[PDB]
Design a protein around this ligand. Structure first.
Ligand SMILES: Nc1ncnc2c1ncn2[C@@H]1O[C@H](COP(=O)(O)CP(=O)(O)OP(=O)(O)O)[C@@H](O)[C@H]1O
Ligand SMILES: Nc1ncnc2c1ncn2[C@@H]1O[C@H](COP(=O)(O)CP(=O)(O)O)[C@@H](O)[C@H]1O
Ligand SMILES: [Fe+3]
Ligand SMILES: [Mg+2]
Ligand SMILES: [Zn+2]
Ligand SMILES: [Zn+2]
Length: 753
């Protein structure tokens, strides 16, 4: 009697990052709330739900999912179907099913506020538990072997739950209800300290070593890192000597935003990036108090991160100083991920070790990011970001592997509407880096069920990535480097039309046998036209000039030597003769149009540096010292087949300023403004010719905050719609995404079968 129940059934599939986020317990709880019966389980394509009940209750259930999905979920699609009623008697979370699809994998996540409260609560049984996590935080990618996500397919598979954790797991009122990684002191991983004898707890042993000025190798989420007191001058010097990493700045971990603000300017948008559970290193302008010498000498920025694992919060209560965190490897080798590996490879580097017995399946570096010109500008996309895919507007024609470049390598694999760009792999410069690259390609193919049908690669035949591409038994598409930079940005912004592409970087292989890197293109995703570039200058020695930048300067001034007397006289007389003869005789000489080399020529000419320890160092120092000015240098654009600007004419005025006694800061500002001004002028010329109003800025020179912001502002004020990289780097870390979407566009055209 009364209202007759009307029972309906719906099948619901949810796609995206929808596993390892506590979606199963969430669904269970809202299904109970709305008196629905049925089942939920992880399948190979995401999340599968069957619910039966009143239509009104099903609708409210769906609305709850849409309105407040789990915190770590990144839902891309929800499918809802009417199905027949089975007369389920209850609602249950059931076993996972492998049905042959594929599903995205969550990045590793920083400790949530609930776990942090429990960690610091002396009455909680997880008080000071170094591996505390829950459905809303902790390692994911780093410990996942396979999908559908479940404890048995993670390195927690060798840590069976104790009776207490199992009770929590099976208790619908517990916040760890069906939490796949649930563990505790009794059943979970443990720390292991190796050094000298210490009778204190492991974290305290680490704190003491750090206070004594020693180097600690710490097993973290993505691999090992080496730490020292960032206020300790000699400790930092010792770390640099032992790692053999002498120039590149060190990132530092600080306890909280309050501490960071003592050393850095922190905007609200930068504060948001720091505090994100993604927990990257964020590049921040220095202000106020100073860290030790040898952290970031001659730069105006510091790379800062906050604690991201429970061990960091524990360590922070024991020390009163920020710490260097640099990856645990000898310079130029992949980050160590295994205990045995670390103890062997870091034996002459670290003084003591903080190990643990939770296997790292997939090693991954810290991410490096920033906020500039109204958006996040990522530099190194790794822990906390990768392996989250870039969303494509349309499903792909077929799966493509894009092999990436040489510097800062990533590869990218497409499937469905995702571009799975890999985490940062590193400079593909040696056998160890290459072996690691190769293994990551195999692991991403397995993890995401990708079987590449076509391989995309750079035109540069010397990249190990290119050699790898050619080694495969697949059709190949070659992609010009600068075209790929522009396409990487187009991909993020769903652009698929001809844009004005400003591709500024150090070196990319051009189609005319020369080095490119200061190019203006008109391109879409399937072609490019080169419209403008810098007048080619000889670069004697090729790889030698990368680090001996006075050689780059000599190349830029080769045909007007007598003008730069003071500079040329500083070069050793015999070496000078040889360099000039080599240029003249075309011995080991490349011809370059390059914003990176232009920057190096300026830095050398005004005596910033004559030699550099790492690629781009001189350009970073030049940017860091710049003054506040609107002044700039005269330039000339000559139009023949293409528009060309001669950088040497600008170098003449720079050297004139230098001889007169102008401050380096002022000269740098004038130089930066000149590049902005001529680039703007070229863009306007091109718009007048073509009607094109979209401008894309990419290539590693746009890591320069000033160039990027000023050009975006100036172009925007003149009506352009301006785009630059945000989710992937404008440096070579982003190249694989551009290669992927270019090759994909070609596949769907008439010029491919
Ligand atoms: N102030 C700053 N500005 C720009 N980049 C910074 C920075 N501080 C740190 N970084 C970057 O953050 C990254 C930290 O990584 P590390 O592990 O310390 C060295 P790496 O580049 O991976 O090579 P290596 O491990 O082979 O020596 C480096 O690329 C470094 O240049
Ligand atoms: N702050 C900066 N200002 C100006 N140029 C920079 C800055 N940082 C890096 N660059 C330039 O960008 C280059 C890196 O460009 P990428 O596109 O990553 C590598 P490639 O030049 O091989 O294509 C560096 O070698 C340097 O020449
Ligand atoms: Fe590049
Ligand atoms: Mg490193
Ligand atoms: Zn948590
Ligand atoms: Zn337990």
């Amino acid at each position: 009697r009364g209202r007759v129940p009307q029972i309906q059934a719906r099948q619901i599939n949810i796609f995206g990052i929808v596993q390892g986020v506590g979606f199963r317990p969430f669904v269970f709880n809202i299904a109970q709330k709305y008196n629905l019966k049925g089942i939920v389980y992880n399948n190979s394509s995401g999340l599968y739900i069957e619910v039966e009940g009143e239509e009104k209750d099903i609708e409210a259930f769906i609305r709850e999912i849409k309105e407040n999905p789990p915190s770590l979920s990144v839902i891309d699609e929800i499918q809802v179907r009417e199905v027949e009623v089975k007369e389920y008697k209850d609602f249950k979370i059931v076993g996972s099913k492998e049905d042959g699809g594929f599903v995205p994998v969550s990045p590793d996540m920083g400790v949530c506020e609930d776990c942090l409260r429990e960690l610091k609560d002396p009455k909680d049984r997880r008080y000071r538990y170094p591996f505390i996590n829950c459905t809303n935080c902790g390692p994911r990618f780093s410990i996942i072997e396979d999908i559908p996500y479940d404890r048995a397919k993670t390195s927690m598979k060798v840590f069976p739950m104790c009776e207490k954790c199992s009770r929590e797991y099976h208790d619908p009122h517990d916040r760890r209800f069906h939490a796949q990684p649930v563990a505790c002191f009794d059943c979970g991983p443990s720390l292991s300290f190796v050094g000298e004898g210490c009778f204190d707890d492991e974290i305290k042993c680490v704190a003491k070593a750090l206070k004594e000025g020693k180097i600690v190798a710490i097993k973290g989420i993505g691999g090992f890192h080496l730490a020292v007191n960032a206020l300790d001058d000699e400790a930092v010097a010792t770390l640099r000597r032992r790692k053999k990493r002498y120039g590149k700045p060190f990132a530092v971990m600080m306890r909280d935003v309050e501490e960071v603000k003592k050393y850095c300017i922190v905007s609200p948008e930068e504060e948001r990036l720091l505090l994100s559970q993604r927990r990257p290193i964020v590049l921040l302008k220095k202000k106020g108090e100073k860290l030790a010498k040898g952290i970031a000498d001659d730069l105006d920025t510091l790379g800062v991160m906050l604690p991201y694992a429970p061990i960091h919060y524990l360590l922070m209560e024991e020390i009163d100083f920020p710490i260097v965190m640099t990856s645990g490897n000898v310079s130029e080798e992949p980050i160590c991920k295994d205990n045995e590996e670390a103890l062997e490879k870091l034996k002459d580097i670290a003084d003591v070790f903080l190990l643990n017995n939770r296997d790292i399946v997939n090693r991954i570096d810290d991410s490096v990011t920033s906020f500039n010109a109204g958006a996040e500008r990522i530099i190194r996309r790794a822990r906390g970001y990768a392996p989250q895919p870039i969303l494509l507007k349309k499903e792909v024609k077929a799966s493509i592997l894009a092999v990436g470049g040489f510097y800062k390598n990533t590869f990218c694999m497409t499937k469905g509407h995702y571009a799975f760009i890999s985490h940062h792999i590193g400079d593909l410069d040696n056998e160890k880096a290459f072996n690691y690259y190769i293994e990551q390609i195999e692991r991403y193919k397995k993890l995401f069920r990708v079987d590449p049908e076509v391989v995309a690669h750079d035109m540069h035949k010397g990249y190990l990535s290119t050699q790898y591409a050619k080694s495969l038994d697949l059709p190949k598409i070659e992609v010009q480097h600068h075209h790929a930079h522009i396409a990487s940005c187009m991909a993020e912004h769903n652009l698929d039309e001809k844009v004005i592409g400003i591709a500024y970087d150090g070196t990319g292989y051009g189609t005319d046998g020369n080095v490119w890197g200061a190019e203006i293109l008109v391109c879409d995703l399937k072609s490019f036209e080169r419209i403008a570039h810098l007048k080619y200058k000889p670069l004697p020695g090729n790889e030698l000039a990368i680090k001996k930048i006075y050689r780059t300067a000599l190349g830029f001034i080769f045909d007007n030597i007598s003008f730069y007397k003071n500079f040329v006289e500083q070069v050793d007389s015999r070496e000078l003769d040889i360099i000039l003869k080599q240029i003249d005789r075309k011995i080991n000489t490349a011809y370059v149009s390059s914003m990176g080399r232009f920057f190096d020529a300026v830095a050398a000419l005004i005596g910033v540096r004559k030699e550099v320890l790492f690629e781009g160092q001189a350009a970073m120092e030049l940017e860091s010292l710049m003054a506040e000015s609107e002044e700039y240098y005269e330039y000339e654009i000559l139009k023949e087949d293409r528009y060309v600007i001669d950088p040497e004419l600008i170098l003449r005025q720079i050297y004139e300023d230098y001889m007169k006694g102008f401050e380096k800061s002022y000269i740098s500002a004038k130089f930066h403004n000149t590049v902005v001004n001529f680039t703007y002028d070229l863009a306007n010329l091109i718009r007048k010719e073509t009607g094109i109003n979209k401008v894309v800025l990419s290539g590693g020179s746009f890591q320069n905050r000033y160039l990027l912001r000023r050009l975006i502002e100036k172009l925007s004020l003149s009506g352009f719609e301006v785009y630059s990289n945000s989710k992937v780097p404008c440096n070579d870390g982003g190249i694989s995404l551009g290669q992927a979407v270019i090759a994909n566009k070609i596949l769907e055209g008439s010029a491919w079968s």
